[PDB]
PDB file of C-alpha atoms and ligand atoms in Angstrom:
ATOM      1  CA  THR A   6     128.483  51.893 100.449  1.00 53.66           C
ATOM      2  CA  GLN A   7     128.534  51.290  96.721  1.00 53.66           C
ATOM      3  CA  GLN A   8     124.895  52.069  96.113  1.00 55.17           C
ATOM      4  CA  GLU A   9     125.066  55.502  97.794  1.00 56.70           C
ATOM      5  CA  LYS A  10     128.312  56.217  95.919  1.00 58.19           C
ATOM      6  CA  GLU A  11     126.658  55.567  92.616  1.00 59.41           C
ATOM      7  CA  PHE A  12     123.752  57.749  93.688  1.00 60.32           C
ATOM      8  CA  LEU A  13     125.899  60.595  94.983  1.00 59.53           C
ATOM      9  CA  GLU A  14     127.909  60.960  91.793  1.00 59.94           C
ATOM     10  CA  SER A  15     124.739  60.801  89.750  1.00 55.75           C
ATOM     11  CA  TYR A  16     123.914  64.464  90.315  1.00 54.42           C
ATOM     12  CA  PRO A  17     126.029  67.630  90.691  1.00 52.20           C
ATOM     13  CA  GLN A  18     127.466  68.017  94.204  1.00 54.94           C
ATOM     14  CA  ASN A  19     128.768  71.625  94.299  1.00 57.92           C
ATOM     15  CA  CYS A  20     126.674  74.716  95.031  1.00 59.88           C
ATOM     16  CA  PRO A  21     127.312  77.755  92.808  1.00 56.91           C
ATOM     17  CA  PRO A  22     130.304  79.818  93.926  1.00 57.21           C
ATOM     18  CA  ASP A  23     128.101  82.818  94.953  1.00 57.95           C
ATOM     19  CA  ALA A  24     126.161  80.690  97.499  1.00 52.52           C
ATOM     20  CA  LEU A  25     126.599  81.309 101.217  1.00 50.40           C
ATOM     21  CA  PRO A  26     130.006  80.163 102.628  1.00 50.42           C
ATOM     22  CA  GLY A  27     130.207  76.821 104.177  1.00 49.22           C
ATOM     23  CA  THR A  28     128.101  75.267 101.374  1.00 53.17           C
ATOM     24  CA  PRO A  29     129.457  72.302  99.308  1.00 54.69           C
ATOM     25  CA  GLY A  30     132.263  73.403  97.008  1.00 55.81           C
ATOM     26  CA  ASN A  31     132.585  76.754  98.893  1.00 54.20           C
ATOM     27  CA  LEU A  32     134.486  75.725 101.929  1.00 51.27           C
ATOM     28  CA  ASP A  33     137.070  77.810 103.774  1.00 52.78           C
ATOM     29  CA  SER A  34     139.966  76.104 105.393  1.00 48.20           C
ATOM     30  CA  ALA A  35     138.788  74.824 108.834  1.00 50.26           C
ATOM     31  CA  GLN A  36     135.377  74.530 107.463  1.00 53.99           C
ATOM     32  CA  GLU A  37     136.927  71.606 105.676  1.00 53.83           C
ATOM     33  CA  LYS A  38     138.642  70.636 108.911  1.00 52.42           C
ATOM     34  CA  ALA A  39     135.373  70.935 110.858  1.00 54.90           C
ATOM     35  CA  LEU A  40     133.699  68.650 108.344  1.00 53.40           C
ATOM     36  CA  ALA A  41     136.362  65.986 108.628  1.00 52.81           C
ATOM     37  CA  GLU A  42     136.299  65.815 112.438  1.00 54.38           C
ATOM     38  CA  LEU A  43     132.533  65.848 112.565  1.00 51.15           C
ATOM     39  CA  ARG A  44     132.557  62.817 110.299  1.00 50.58           C
ATOM     40  CA  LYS A  45     135.096  60.774 112.331  1.00 51.53           C
ATOM     41  CA  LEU A  46     133.181  61.497 115.541  1.00 51.10           C
ATOM     42  CA  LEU A  47     129.967  60.213 113.919  1.00 52.37           C
ATOM     43  CA  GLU A  48     131.875  57.138 112.548  1.00 49.73           C
ATOM     44  CA  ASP A  49     133.506  56.460 115.964  1.00 52.88           C
ATOM     45  CA  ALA A  50     129.952  56.409 117.334  1.00 50.82           C
ATOM     46  CA  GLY A  51     129.026  53.776 114.777  1.00 48.17           C
ATOM     47  CA  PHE A  52     126.861  55.835 112.399  1.00 47.99           C
ATOM     48  CA  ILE A  53     127.087  54.656 108.753  1.00 52.69           C
ATOM     49  CA  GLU A  54     124.316  56.524 106.896  1.00 51.76           C
ATOM     50  CA  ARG A  55     123.877  60.131 105.936  1.00 51.92           C
ATOM     51  CA  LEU A  56     127.562  61.030 106.424  1.00 53.12           C
ATOM     52  CA  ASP A  57     127.910  62.780 103.080  1.00 53.18           C
ATOM     53  CA  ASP A  58     129.268  66.289 102.618  1.00 55.51           C
ATOM     54  CA  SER A  59     125.901  67.961 101.908  1.00 53.87           C
ATOM     55  CA  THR A  60     124.200  66.443 104.896  1.00 53.64           C
ATOM     56  CA  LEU A  61     126.905  67.107 107.500  1.00 56.79           C
ATOM     57  CA  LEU A  62     127.545  70.662 106.216  1.00 57.80           C
ATOM     58  CA  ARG A  63     123.830  71.405 106.772  1.00 56.88           C
ATOM     59  CA  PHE A  64     124.154  70.289 110.404  1.00 59.24           C
ATOM     60  CA  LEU A  65     127.357  72.264 110.774  1.00 61.86           C
ATOM     61  CA  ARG A  66     125.893  75.477 109.291  1.00 63.20           C
ATOM     62  CA  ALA A  67     122.907  75.153 111.565  1.00 61.75           C
ATOM     63  CA  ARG A  68     125.234  75.208 114.583  1.00 62.52           C
ATOM     64  CA  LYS A  69     127.670  77.762 113.207  1.00 60.79           C
ATOM     65  CA  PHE A  70     130.242  75.037 112.685  1.00 61.85           C
ATOM     66  CA  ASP A  71     130.414  74.211 116.333  1.00 59.03           C
ATOM     67  CA  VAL A  72     131.389  70.600 115.841  1.00 53.23           C
ATOM     68  CA  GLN A  73     130.215  69.232 119.126  1.00 52.28           C
ATOM     69  CA  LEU A  74     126.822  70.909 118.889  1.00 51.99           C
ATOM     70  CA  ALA A  75     126.381  69.753 115.338  1.00 51.94           C
ATOM     71  CA  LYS A  76     127.157  66.248 116.406  1.00 56.09           C
ATOM     72  CA  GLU A  77     124.579  66.346 119.130  1.00 53.36           C
ATOM     73  CA  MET A  78     122.015  67.736 116.677  1.00 52.46           C
ATOM     74  CA  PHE A  79     122.839  64.940 114.261  1.00 54.38           C
ATOM     75  CA  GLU A  80     122.542  62.194 116.945  1.00 53.18           C
ATOM     76  CA  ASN A  81     119.299  63.745 118.115  1.00 53.69           C
ATOM     77  CA  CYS A  82     117.971  63.552 114.524  1.00 53.22           C
ATOM     78  CA  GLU A  83     118.982  59.929 113.950  1.00 51.88           C
ATOM     79  CA  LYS A  84     117.246  58.987 117.285  1.00 51.59           C
ATOM     80  CA  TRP A  85     114.063  60.687 116.015  1.00 52.17           C
ATOM     81  CA  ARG A  86     114.348  58.930 112.637  1.00 48.79           C
ATOM     82  CA  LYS A  87     114.463  55.545 114.566  1.00 50.23           C
ATOM     83  CA  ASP A  88     111.540  56.349 116.990  1.00 48.90           C
ATOM     84  CA  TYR A  89     109.395  57.817 114.224  1.00 47.25           C
ATOM     85  CA  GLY A  90     110.216  55.212 111.583  1.00 49.00           C
ATOM     86  CA  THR A  91     111.365  57.834 109.105  1.00 48.42           C
ATOM     87  CA  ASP A  92     113.885  55.579 107.286  1.00 46.95           C
ATOM     88  CA  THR A  93     110.907  53.508 106.086  1.00 45.78           C
ATOM     89  CA  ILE A  94     108.059  56.003 105.933  1.00 44.96           C
ATOM     90  CA  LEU A  95     107.947  55.896 102.097  1.00 45.14           C
ATOM     91  CA  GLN A  96     106.951  52.236 102.174  1.00 46.52           C
ATOM     92  CA  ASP A  97     104.913  52.222 105.422  1.00 46.16           C
ATOM     93  CA  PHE A  98     102.616  55.236 105.201  1.00 45.86           C
ATOM     94  CA  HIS A  99      99.799  55.663 102.665  1.00 46.32           C
ATOM     95  CA  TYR A 100      97.875  58.948 102.630  1.00 45.45           C
ATOM     96  CA  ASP A 101      94.818  57.485 100.960  1.00 44.40           C
ATOM     97  CA  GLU A 102      92.704  60.311 102.311  1.00 45.16           C
ATOM     98  CA  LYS A 103      94.529  62.929 100.285  1.00 44.43           C
ATOM     99  CA  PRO A 104      91.907  63.280  97.465  1.00 46.48           C
ATOM    100  CA  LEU A 105      89.209  63.780 100.111  1.00 44.99           C
ATOM    101  CA  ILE A 106      90.874  66.423 102.192  1.00 46.43           C
ATOM    102  CA  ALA A 107      93.472  68.262  99.951  1.00 44.87           C
ATOM    103  CA  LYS A 108      91.013  71.178  99.345  1.00 43.63           C
ATOM    104  CA  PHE A 109      90.766  71.709 103.145  1.00 43.77           C
ATOM    105  CA  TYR A 110      94.584  72.388 103.429  1.00 42.12           C
ATOM    106  CA  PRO A 111      96.175  72.660 100.006  1.00 37.73           C
ATOM    107  CA  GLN A 112      99.909  71.592  99.921  1.00 40.35           C
ATOM    108  CA  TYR A 113     101.719  70.793  96.736  1.00 37.85           C
ATOM    109  CA  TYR A 114     105.042  70.907  94.948  1.00 40.71           C
ATOM    110  CA  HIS A 115     105.136  72.496  91.481  1.00 43.10           C
ATOM    111  CA  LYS A 116     108.284  72.938  89.330  1.00 45.34           C
ATOM    112  CA  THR A 117     111.301  75.042  90.216  1.00 45.24           C
ATOM    113  CA  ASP A 118     112.516  78.654  90.898  1.00 50.17           C
ATOM    114  CA  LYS A 119     115.279  80.399  88.978  1.00 49.05           C
ATOM    115  CA  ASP A 120     117.942  78.967  91.202  1.00 49.33           C
ATOM    116  CA  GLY A 121     116.565  75.366  90.546  1.00 53.10           C
ATOM    117  CA  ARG A 122     114.825  74.923  93.885  1.00 52.76           C
ATOM    118  CA  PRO A 123     111.625  72.864  93.911  1.00 55.83           C
ATOM    119  CA  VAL A 124     108.694  75.132  94.743  1.00 56.18           C
ATOM    120  CA  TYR A 125     106.426  74.233  97.576  1.00 59.41           C
ATOM    121  CA  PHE A 126     102.940  75.806  97.864  1.00 61.02           C
ATOM    122  CA  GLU A 127     100.850  75.970 100.979  1.00 64.52           C
ATOM    123  CA  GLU A 128      97.482  77.717 100.912  1.00 63.83           C
ATOM    124  CA  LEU A 129      97.344  78.039 104.676  1.00 66.33           C
ATOM    125  CA  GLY A 130      94.584  80.800 104.468  1.00 71.19           C
ATOM    126  CA  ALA A 131      92.035  78.271 103.084  1.00 71.25           C
ATOM    127  CA  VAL A 132      92.694  75.864 106.002  1.00 72.27           C
ATOM    128  CA  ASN A 133      89.533  74.124 107.313  1.00 68.78           C
ATOM    129  CA  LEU A 134      90.508  71.744 110.082  1.00 66.66           C
ATOM    130  CA  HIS A 135      86.870  71.194 111.092  1.00 65.38           C
ATOM    131  CA  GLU A 136      86.261  69.449 107.800  1.00 64.06           C
ATOM    132  CA  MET A 137      89.726  67.813 107.711  1.00 61.01           C
ATOM    133  CA  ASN A 138      89.306  66.251 111.095  1.00 61.60           C
ATOM    134  CA  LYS A 139      86.174  64.444 109.893  1.00 58.70           C
ATOM    135  CA  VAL A 140      88.462  62.266 107.796  1.00 59.45           C
ATOM    136  CA  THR A 141      92.104  62.503 109.222  1.00 57.20           C
ATOM    137  CA  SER A 142      94.126  63.498 112.242  1.00 55.60           C
ATOM    138  CA  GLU A 143      96.925  65.989 113.021  1.00 54.29           C
ATOM    139  CA  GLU A 144      99.157  62.893 113.527  1.00 54.30           C
ATOM    140  CA  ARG A 145      98.500  61.720 109.970  1.00 50.05           C
ATOM    141  CA  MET A 146      98.982  65.159 108.489  1.00 49.05           C
ATOM    142  CA  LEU A 147     102.416  65.214 110.107  1.00 45.46           C
ATOM    143  CA  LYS A 148     103.341  61.720 108.849  1.00 46.47           C
ATOM    144  CA  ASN A 149     102.264  63.005 105.366  1.00 45.42           C
ATOM    145  CA  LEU A 150     104.596  65.981 105.867  1.00 44.15           C
ATOM    146  CA  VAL A 151     107.510  63.839 106.684  1.00 40.88           C
ATOM    147  CA  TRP A 152     106.598  61.517 103.849  1.00 38.14           C
ATOM    148  CA  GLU A 153     106.879  64.506 101.512  1.00 37.28           C
ATOM    149  CA  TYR A 154     110.152  65.638 103.093  1.00 37.87           C
ATOM    150  CA  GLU A 155     111.664  62.210 102.517  1.00 40.11           C
ATOM    151  CA  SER A 156     110.544  62.332  98.921  1.00 36.90           C
ATOM    152  CA  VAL A 157     112.055  65.802  98.526  1.00 37.61           C
ATOM    153  CA  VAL A 158     115.455  64.490  99.841  1.00 36.36           C
ATOM    154  CA  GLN A 159     115.447  61.156  98.028  1.00 36.30           C
ATOM    155  CA  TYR A 160     113.839  62.179  94.714  1.00 36.02           C
ATOM    156  CA  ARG A 161     113.073  65.771  94.163  1.00 36.97           C
ATOM    157  CA  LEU A 162     116.329  67.423  95.146  1.00 35.21           C
ATOM    158  CA  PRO A 163     118.513  64.969  93.147  1.00 34.97           C
ATOM    159  CA  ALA A 164     116.440  65.631  89.998  1.00 34.84           C
ATOM    160  CA  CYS A 165     116.441  69.377  90.616  1.00 37.14           C
ATOM    161  CA  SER A 166     120.207  69.322  90.950  1.00 34.03           C
ATOM    162  CA  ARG A 167     120.627  67.624  87.654  1.00 30.06           C
ATOM    163  CA  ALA A 168     118.186  69.998  85.868  1.00 29.18           C
ATOM    164  CA  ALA A 169     119.946  72.978  87.413  1.00 27.34           C
ATOM    165  CA  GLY A 170     123.549  72.029  86.665  1.00 29.84           C
ATOM    166  CA  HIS A 171     124.521  72.514  90.326  1.00 29.50           C
ATOM    167  CA  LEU A 172     123.680  71.110  93.707  1.00 28.89           C
ATOM    168  CA  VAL A 173     120.231  72.026  94.975  1.00 29.06           C
ATOM    169  CA  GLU A 174     119.690  71.475  98.731  1.00 26.71           C
ATOM    170  CA  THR A 175     116.712  73.771  99.506  1.00 27.26           C
ATOM    171  CA  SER A 176     113.181  74.615  98.489  1.00 31.77           C
ATOM    172  CA  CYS A 177     111.242  77.749  97.695  1.00 30.60           C
ATOM    173  CA  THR A 178     108.184  77.971  99.870  1.00 30.26           C
ATOM    174  CA  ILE A 179     105.105  80.115  98.907  1.00 32.74           C
ATOM    175  CA  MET A 180     102.563  80.317 101.725  1.00 35.43           C
ATOM    176  CA  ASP A 181      99.244  82.009 100.717  1.00 35.48           C
ATOM    177  CA  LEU A 182      97.504  83.649 103.637  1.00 35.17           C
ATOM    178  CA  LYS A 183      94.363  84.630 101.649  1.00 35.32           C
ATOM    179  CA  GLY A 184      91.474  83.786 103.923  1.00 31.91           C
ATOM    180  CA  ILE A 185      92.975  83.421 107.424  1.00 31.08           C
ATOM    181  CA  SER A 186      91.270  84.840 110.442  1.00 28.23           C
ATOM    182  CA  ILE A 187      92.354  85.057 114.007  1.00 33.36           C
ATOM    183  CA  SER A 188      90.202  81.996 114.573  1.00 31.53           C
ATOM    184  CA  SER A 189      91.591  79.784 111.784  1.00 31.28           C
ATOM    185  CA  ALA A 190      95.141  80.914 112.713  1.00 29.46           C
ATOM    186  CA  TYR A 191      94.719  79.596 116.207  1.00 33.08           C
ATOM    187  CA  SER A 192      93.191  76.362 114.800  1.00 34.16           C
ATOM    188  CA  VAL A 193      96.291  75.606 112.685  1.00 34.55           C
ATOM    189  CA  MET A 194      98.887  76.796 115.199  1.00 35.65           C
ATOM    190  CA  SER A 195      99.661  73.354 116.610  1.00 31.81           C
ATOM    191  CA  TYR A 196     100.259  71.748 113.275  1.00 30.33           C
ATOM    192  CA  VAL A 197     102.403  74.714 112.237  1.00 26.61           C
ATOM    193  CA  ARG A 198     104.405  74.482 115.445  1.00 26.18           C
ATOM    194  CA  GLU A 199     105.030  70.751 115.064  1.00 23.95           C
ATOM    195  CA  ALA A 200     105.910  71.132 111.373  1.00 21.30           C
ATOM    196  CA  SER A 201     108.349  73.936 112.087  1.00 23.15           C
ATOM    197  CA  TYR A 202     109.918  71.858 114.899  1.00 22.64           C
ATOM    198  CA  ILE A 203     110.420  68.943 112.597  1.00 19.69           C
ATOM    199  CA  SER A 204     111.807  71.177 109.817  1.00 21.30           C
ATOM    200  CA  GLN A 205     114.359  73.046 112.037  1.00 18.03           C
ATOM    201  CA  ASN A 206     115.572  70.062 113.958  1.00 17.77           C
ATOM    202  CA  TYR A 207     115.514  67.102 111.565  1.00 15.82           C
ATOM    203  CA  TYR A 208     115.800  68.862 108.224  1.00 17.05           C
ATOM    204  CA  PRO A 209     118.124  71.760 108.944  1.00 15.88           C
ATOM    205  CA  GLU A 210     119.099  74.297 106.317  1.00 14.53           C
ATOM    206  CA  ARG A 211     116.480  73.016 103.820  1.00 15.56           C
ATOM    207  CA  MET A 212     114.754  76.363 103.652  1.00 13.97           C
ATOM    208  CA  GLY A 213     116.060  78.416 100.684  1.00 15.71           C
ATOM    209  CA  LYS A 214     113.293  80.958 100.202  1.00 16.11           C
ATOM    210  CA  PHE A 215     110.043  81.565 102.112  1.00 17.76           C
ATOM    211  CA  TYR A 216     107.440  83.833 100.662  1.00 15.50           C
ATOM    212  CA  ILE A 217     104.302  84.756 102.576  1.00 13.07           C
ATOM    213  CA  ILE A 218     101.667  86.335 100.208  1.00 14.95           C
ATOM    214  CA  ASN A 219      98.258  87.980 100.729  1.00 18.32           C
ATOM    215  CA  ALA A 220      99.441  88.737 104.250  1.00 15.53           C
ATOM    216  CA  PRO A 221      97.067  90.773 106.427  1.00 15.22           C
ATOM    217  CA  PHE A 222      97.890  94.478 106.867  1.00 13.95           C
ATOM    218  CA  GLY A 223      99.108  94.396 110.477  1.00 13.44           C
ATOM    219  CA  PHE A 224     101.223  91.270 109.815  1.00 14.37           C
ATOM    220  CA  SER A 225     102.768  92.786 106.642  1.00 16.08           C
ATOM    221  CA  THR A 226     103.319  96.173 108.307  1.00 14.84           C
ATOM    222  CA  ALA A 227     105.102  94.634 111.227  1.00 16.51           C
ATOM    223  CA  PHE A 228     107.607  93.036 108.862  1.00 18.48           C
ATOM    224  CA  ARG A 229     108.080  96.241 106.924  1.00 18.09           C
ATOM    225  CA  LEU A 230     109.061  98.066 110.021  1.00 17.12           C
ATOM    226  CA  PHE A 231     111.572  95.506 111.535  1.00 13.33           C
ATOM    227  CA  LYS A 232     113.336  94.437 108.272  1.00 13.35           C
ATOM    228  CA  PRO A 233     116.210  96.824 108.878  1.00 11.64           C
ATOM    229  CA  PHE A 234     117.102  94.807 111.988  1.00 13.05           C
ATOM    230  CA  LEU A 235     117.213  91.354 110.447  1.00 16.91           C
ATOM    231  CA  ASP A 236     120.608  89.946 109.498  1.00 17.97           C
ATOM    232  CA  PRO A 237     121.135  90.282 105.775  1.00 14.35           C
ATOM    233  CA  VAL A 238     121.090  86.547 105.246  1.00 13.33           C
ATOM    234  CA  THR A 239     117.550  86.350 106.593  1.00 14.80           C
ATOM    235  CA  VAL A 240     116.313  89.397 104.625  1.00 15.09           C
ATOM    236  CA  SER A 241     117.329  87.790 101.356  1.00 14.83           C
ATOM    237  CA  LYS A 242     115.391  84.641 102.284  1.00 15.28           C
ATOM    238  CA  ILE A 243     112.121  85.710 103.856  1.00 16.34           C
ATOM    239  CA  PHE A 244     109.573  87.896 102.100  1.00 17.41           C
ATOM    240  CA  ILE A 245     106.225  88.948 103.497  1.00 14.28           C
ATOM    241  CA  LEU A 246     103.993  90.337 100.757  1.00 12.77           C
ATOM    242  CA  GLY A 247     100.457  91.648 100.604  1.00 10.47           C
ATOM    243  CA  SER A 248      98.039  91.565  97.690  1.00  8.49           C
ATOM    244  CA  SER A 249     100.497  92.624  95.060  1.00  7.30           C
ATOM    245  CA  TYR A 250     102.923  89.821  95.159  1.00  8.06           C
ATOM    246  CA  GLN A 251     102.977  88.616  91.564  1.00  9.36           C
ATOM    247  CA  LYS A 252     105.840  90.806  90.324  1.00  7.60           C
ATOM    248  CA  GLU A 253     107.982  89.759  93.299  1.00  3.52           C
ATOM    249  CA  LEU A 254     107.222  86.100  92.645  1.00  4.88           C
ATOM    250  CA  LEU A 255     108.128  86.482  88.957  1.00  3.29           C
ATOM    251  CA  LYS A 256     111.555  87.833  89.903  1.00  3.99           C
ATOM    252  CA  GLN A 257     112.177  84.487  91.615  1.00  5.78           C
ATOM    253  CA  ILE A 258     110.277  81.912  89.502  1.00  6.76           C
ATOM    254  CA  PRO A 259     110.002  81.708  85.721  1.00  3.16           C
ATOM    255  CA  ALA A 260     106.649  82.700  84.507  1.00  2.00           C
ATOM    256  CA  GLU A 261     106.209  79.339  82.731  1.00  2.00           C
ATOM    257  CA  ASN A 262     106.849  77.516  86.080  1.00  2.00           C
ATOM    258  CA  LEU A 263     104.528  79.717  88.282  1.00  4.13           C
ATOM    259  CA  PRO A 264     100.869  78.548  88.398  1.00  3.11           C
ATOM    260  CA  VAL A 265      98.449  81.031  86.647  1.00  2.00           C
ATOM    261  CA  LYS A 266      96.503  81.666  89.847  1.00  2.00           C
ATOM    262  CA  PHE A 267      99.674  83.206  91.396  1.00  2.00           C
ATOM    263  CA  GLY A 268     100.455  85.403  88.332  1.00  2.55           C
ATOM    264  CA  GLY A 269     102.328  82.951  86.127  1.00  4.17           C
ATOM    265  CA  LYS A 270     101.525  80.845  83.087  1.00  7.11           C
ATOM    266  CA  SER A 271     101.948  77.228  84.328  1.00  7.71           C
ATOM    267  CA  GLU A 272      98.748  75.204  83.858  1.00  8.18           C
ATOM    268  CA  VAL A 273      97.567  71.764  85.068  1.00  6.74           C
ATOM    269  CA  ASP A 274      94.619  69.622  83.982  1.00  7.64           C
ATOM    270  CA  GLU A 275      91.907  70.948  86.381  1.00  7.93           C
ATOM    271  CA  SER A 276      89.813  67.918  85.366  1.00  7.50           C
ATOM    272  CA  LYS A 277      92.084  65.503  87.109  1.00  8.12           C
ATOM    273  CA  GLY A 278      91.856  67.835  90.196  1.00  8.74           C
ATOM    274  CA  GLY A 279      95.199  68.951  89.080  1.00  8.71           C
ATOM    275  CA  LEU A 280      96.956  71.488  91.160  1.00  5.36           C
ATOM    276  CA  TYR A 281      96.032  70.211  94.629  1.00  4.81           C
ATOM    277  CA  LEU A 282      96.809  66.587  93.550  1.00  4.66           C
ATOM    278  CA  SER A 283      99.611  67.202  91.152  1.00  4.31           C
ATOM    279  CA  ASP A 284     103.303  66.738  91.662  1.00  2.00           C
ATOM    280  CA  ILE A 285     105.001  68.206  88.498  1.00  3.67           C
ATOM    281  CA  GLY A 286     108.635  68.919  88.125  1.00  2.00           C
ATOM    282  CA  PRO A 287     112.025  67.704  87.007  1.00  2.00           C
ATOM    283  CA  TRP A 288     111.565  64.669  89.240  1.00  2.57           C
ATOM    284  CA  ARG A 289     108.818  63.525  86.835  1.00  2.00           C
ATOM    285  CA  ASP A 290     111.145  63.964  83.805  1.00  2.00           C
ATOM    286  CA  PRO A 291     113.174  60.777  82.815  1.00  2.00           C
ATOM    287  CA  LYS A 292     116.140  62.914  81.669  1.00  2.00           C
ATOM    288  CA  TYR A 293     116.587  64.006  85.341  1.00  2.00           C
ATOM    289  CA  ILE A 294     115.723  60.820  87.160  1.00  2.00           C
ATOM    290  CA  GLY A 295     118.856  58.869  88.305  1.00  2.00           C
ATOM    291  CA  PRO A 296     119.461  55.399  89.740  1.00  2.00           C
ATOM    292  CA  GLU A 297     117.048  56.147  92.646  1.00  2.00           C
ATOM    293  CA  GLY A 298     114.137  55.813  90.076  1.00  2.00           C
ATOM    294  CA  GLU A 299     111.066  57.862  89.987  1.00  2.00           C
ATOM    295  CA  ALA A 300     109.455  59.149  93.228  1.00  2.00           C
ATOM    296  CA  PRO A 301     106.280  57.355  94.359  1.00  2.00           C
ATOM    297  CA  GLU A 302     102.793  58.842  94.124  1.00  2.00           C
TER     298      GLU A 302
HETATM  299  O1  IUC B 427     112.340  74.143 106.503  1.00  2.00           O
HETATM  300  C1  IUC B 427     111.526  73.817 105.553  1.00  2.00           C
HETATM  301  C2  IUC B 427     111.823  72.464 104.928  1.00  2.00           C
HETATM  302  C3  IUC B 427     111.968  71.326 105.747  1.00  2.00           C
HETATM  303  C4  IUC B 427     112.299  70.120 105.038  1.00  2.00           C
HETATM  304  C5  IUC B 427     112.429  70.099 103.732  1.00  2.00           C
HETATM  305 BR1  IUC B 427     112.839  68.443 102.815  1.00  2.00          BR
HETATM  306  C6  IUC B 427     112.257  71.185 102.956  1.00  2.00           C
HETATM  307  N1  IUC B 427     112.289  71.187 101.572  1.00  2.00           N
HETATM  308  O2  IUC B 427     113.642  71.375 100.906  1.00  2.00           O
HETATM  309  O3  IUC B 427     111.325  71.123 100.893  1.00  2.00           O
HETATM  310  C7  IUC B 427     111.882  72.433 103.517  1.00  2.00           C
HETATM  311  N2  IUC B 427     110.510  74.595 105.325  1.00  2.00           N
HETATM  312  C8  IUC B 427     110.388  75.984 105.784  1.00  2.00           C
HETATM  313  C9  IUC B 427     109.217  75.952 106.857  1.00  2.00           C
HETATM  314  N3  IUC B 427     108.042  75.179 106.274  1.00  2.00           N
HETATM  315  C10 IUC B 427     106.841  75.310 106.858  1.00  2.00           C
HETATM  316  C11 IUC B 427     106.802  75.317 108.301  1.00  2.00           C
HETATM  317  C12 IUC B 427     105.578  75.327 108.992  1.00  2.00           C
HETATM  318  C13 IUC B 427     104.320  75.410 108.252  1.00  2.00           C
HETATM  319  C14 IUC B 427     104.381  75.443 106.872  1.00  2.00           C
HETATM  320  C15 IUC B 427     105.549  75.336 106.192  1.00  2.00           C
HETATM  321  F1  IUC B 427     105.451  75.340 104.846  1.00  2.00           F
HETATM  322  C16 IUC B 427     108.155  74.068 105.317  1.00  2.00           C
HETATM  323  C17 IUC B 427     109.421  74.213 104.366  1.00  2.00           C
END
């Protein structure tokens, strides 16, 4: 492609050798063969974009390296990208409402975890859709979600990879449940369902860690009891914490990267409405920004 080539060699392309098998740089024989035949099948069908190792290995991992199922998942994704306009969302969609409604559903990226992943924060427990729907719609909240996803893929992950010295394909999510009720949980359920559907089918294998904090007692207790029955890959990725989550977060995120309100030392200018409207991280550092240029605001 010659633009993509330049871009792909501008950040580290191998995962650390202790990552899960089937990740870039960690391929078994016939995990290399499955990658090759998936590519030629997508080429024979006329696809020319997003045929890099990282991308195709995510679709393969999501289908246990069943090549035909991974191909069908990829084709389904490209069809959604065309119907939804995803390839041009960064230029077409403008979430001008965000300063008005961010406080009614706080969502923000902030710095990185110890593995180099960008950290994504979601204060779901504070959600107030009754006030949000005075100004925006669920449809526009989802466009904004995909807008941010495209910005993670095009800008944040390449910069995080450079800052980390190795390929970074995934994020660390912190979802704060402080404040949910049964009522507000039902009110946010449709958005969460659509978001999760988009994530799993169109962004497979992008979830690296997922921490729920300030979980209600019954919710946290259910997880405590059934942990022994989750596959050990899942149990190293999902954490359901109650009120005392700070020490657990600090095992995964450097204290100088974790916001103070969650037990860390990272501070933003609260006068510029900083945390809820900030986007601080290696992707805002010129020494980690490559030929793609800096991510938009
Ligand atoms: O799978 C993902 C996910 C999807 C796409 C992308 Br580009 C990233 N990423 O690397 O930032 C993560 N997530 C896990 C589930 N997520 C989620 C789902 C429903 C509601 C709220 C959420 F935060 C979002 C993050």
